[PDB]
Write a protein that binds this DNA or RNA. Structure first.
Ligand SMILES: [As]
Ligand SMILES: [Zn+2]
Length: 193
DNA sequence: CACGCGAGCATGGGTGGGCAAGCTGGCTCT
DNA sequence: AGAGCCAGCTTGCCCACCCATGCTCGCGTG
């Protein structure tokens, strides 16, 4: 019945967690990436056990604040009309995946929420993780889109059957100056949090 | 013994200060 | 000689205070 997807961490039986390696900088204190518009934001997928064949990785944005949570996260009308299309991403989608030949962009028939899915691929031998390159195609501040409202990215590991294997999430701010903004927010947390 | 009146209250709204956040300007760098 | 920084600027927006205005309340009246 809910149209709001869960943001609850579920590291699950496979021991699923994310890693993060200026265009992009991660704050572990905030669990929050600070990204520039349309720039690569690499996210690592770590598991303790190997998911089954046909496992998929989905990413979806939701507004972080209770008052906005039920509103679907979409690109603003300016960026939507911008001719920055890679050929596969529908222009209303905020989150894209770059560098994957099997990306699928979904628009939920019931909830109208946008997601982007790629096959899960096990790390190379001797590698601890697999990396997916996401891009956020609007600033947090975009008038008529996010409009300065913080978002969470929800990453789910899903079997081909649709069972939830794992779920992790991190906040995102897409902004002109990620370094400045990370420092500001961390100082605000230490001083007034 | 119902009503009239002046005092004060409640409650949405305005205002000024400060903040947020893309952007510009100069140096520096290569 | 184009480009990268870093500081500072710009500008919508937030926030707290105060105001605005219908209504309540106790007094006194008729
Ligand atoms: As990023
Ligand atoms: Zn936008």
């Amino acid at each position: 019945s809910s149209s709001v997807p869960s943001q609850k961490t579920y590291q699950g039986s496979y021991g699923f967690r994310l890693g993060f390696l200026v265009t992009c900088t991660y704050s572990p204190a905030l669990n929050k990436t600070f990204c520039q518009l349309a720039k690569t934001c690499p996210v690592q997928l770590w598991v303790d056990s190997t998911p089954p064949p046909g496992t998929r990785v989905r990413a979806m944005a939701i507004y972080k604040q209770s008052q906005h949570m039920t509103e679907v996260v979409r690109r603003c009308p300016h960026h939507e009309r911008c001719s920055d299309s890679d050929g596969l991403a529908p222009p209303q989608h905020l989150i894209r995946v770059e560098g994957n030949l099997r990306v699928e962009y979904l628009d939920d028939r019931n909830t109208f929420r946008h997601s982007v899915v790629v096959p899960y691929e096990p790390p190379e031998v001797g590698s601890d993780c697999t990396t997916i390159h996401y891009n956020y195609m609007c600033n947090s501040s975009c008038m008529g889109g996010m409009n300065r409202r913080p978002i969470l990215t929800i990453i789910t590991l899903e079997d081909s059957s649709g069972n939830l294997l794992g779920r992790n999430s991190f906040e995102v701010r897409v902004c002109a100056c990620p370094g400045r903004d990370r420092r500001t927010e961390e100082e605000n947390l230490r001083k007034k949090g």
